């Protein structure tokens, strides 16, 4: 990570900064739009008691 | 004085600061140096290694005096001349007329070499010297004169 951190620091500086190279935790998810096309929702229900044996 | 003392402060409490359970009793671990090799050994080794057993030769009827021989280091040495006179000898450091210091007269038995005297010449009268003390004393143009 060090050896890499040096690089993107060079790649920034030389260019004209804006780096940000601390690690960060998993962030929560952003919004998103899920389409229904090819994928209408399947409705499930709970299933009755049964024995097999 | 009694007035500043914790026992004035313990008045009214039951156990005088000695505890209710353990109590204050006469001689719990035994008296004095009891227990040394048994229930007090951990304390004795640690804090007092060396304590039990013997080393070395007995000497019957030893007379300290026989071995009286105080040390003085070059360190000092010029201290054995009073200051008024000291400066007179420090400057005009020479043969022909160099100070005689009688280190036995001052009550020393051996001259040792802790460190650095000025280049001034001294005539040093003593019973014993350490090889270094003499070397150093000489490199300033002095001598040791062995007395008794």
């Amino acid at each position: 990570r060090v050896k890499a951190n040096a690089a993107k620091r060079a790649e920034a500086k030389a260019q004209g900064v804006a780096v940000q190279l601390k690690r960060q935790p998993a962030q929560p998810r952003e919004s998103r739009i899920v389409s229904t096309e090819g994928n209408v929702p399947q409705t499930l229900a709970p299933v009755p008691y049964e024995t097999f044996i | 004085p009694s007035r500043f003392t914790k026992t004035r402060k313990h008045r009214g409490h039951v156990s005088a600061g000695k505890g209710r359970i353990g109590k204050h009793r006469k001689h719990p671990g035994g008296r004095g140096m009891a227990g040394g090799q048994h229930h007090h050994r951990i304390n004795m080794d640690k804090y007092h290694p060396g304590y039990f057993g013997k080393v070395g030769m007995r000497y019957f009827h030893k007379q300290q005096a026989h071995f009286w021989k105080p040390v003085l280091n070059l360190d000092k040495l010029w201290t054995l001349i009073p200051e008024d006179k000291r400066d007179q000898y420090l400057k005009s450091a020479s043969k022909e007329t160099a100070p005689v210091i009688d280190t036995l007269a001052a009550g020393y038995g051996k001259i040792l070499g802790k460190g650095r005297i000025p280049n001034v010449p001294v005539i040093v009268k003593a019973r014993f010297v350490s090889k270094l003390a003499e070397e150093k004393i000489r490199a300033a143009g002095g001598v040791v004169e062995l007395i008794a």
């Binding site: 935790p25 998103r32 739009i33 899920v34 389409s35 229904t36 | -």
Partner: protein, 222 residues
């Protein structure tokens, strides 16, 4: 010696100058907030229109209230409650949600109530029970100069600036949020709504993530 008015001149004009900056800044935020809400609303509406589902971003900010007293508490959750600054019953703090704090929240679910706070309740938390930490010494917010003196360095030179850094989880949420002494809340005024507090919200108890239902609780407590 002038100063009489002569340096009361600088001061009053400069103070006047600041309220101006605060005035336009608070106008900005209110536009920022209300188009922020409207967009999400038209998001959902557009997505239905297209035959689709707009799934909101997951919440980035939670607000945690310690619901449990100080006795008989296992070590691991005890430490976490300390680090989240919840060391007495009914006090609360804000928390930026990342994987590394989720797991904190998880370890303390039986002792806390938390959820996603609305603008209204972050605003009324801070206007009412908001206190800075200043050379320790818990100091009430009450004047904007108190804020600018300790958070100015980060932009943030007023009370609604503070709120804004909180609710939008800004680049300086850590300094901003730590600045706020943990909030000391009362017991809920109309009560807890449940017979027994110490089971999960989902089982008719009070502890855990109750999501947006936190606003009703915290308002009743504030």
């Amino acid at each position: 010696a002038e100063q009489v008015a002569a340096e009361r001149a600088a001061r009053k004009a400069a103070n006047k100058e600041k309220r101006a900056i605060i005035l336009e800044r608070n106008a900005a935020y209110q536009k920022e907030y209300e188009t922020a809400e409207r967009n999400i609303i038209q998001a959902k509406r557009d997505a239905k229109a297209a035959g689709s589902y707009y799934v909101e971003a997951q919440h980035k900010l939670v607000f945690v209230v310690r619901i449990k007293g100080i006795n008989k508490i296992p070590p691991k959750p005890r430490k976490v409650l300390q680090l989240l600054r919840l060391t007495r019953i009914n006090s609360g703090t804000f928390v930026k949600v990342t994987k590394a704090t989720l797991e904190l929240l998880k370890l303390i679910e039986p002792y806390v109530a938390y959820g996603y706070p609305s603008y209204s309740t972050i605003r009324q938390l801070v206007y009412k029970r908001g206190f800075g930490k200043i050379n320790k010494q818990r100091v009430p917010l009450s004047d904007n100069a108190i804020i600018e003196a300790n958070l100015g360095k980060y932009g943030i030179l007023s009370i609604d600036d503070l709120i804004h850094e909180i609710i939008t989880v800004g680049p300086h949420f850590k300094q901003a949020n730590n600045f706020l002494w943990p909030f000391k809340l009362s017991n809920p005024s109309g009560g807890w709504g449940v017979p027994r507090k110490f089971k999960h919200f989902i089982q008719g108890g009070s502890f855990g993530n109750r999501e947006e239902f936190i606003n009703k609780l915290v308002k009743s407590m504030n």
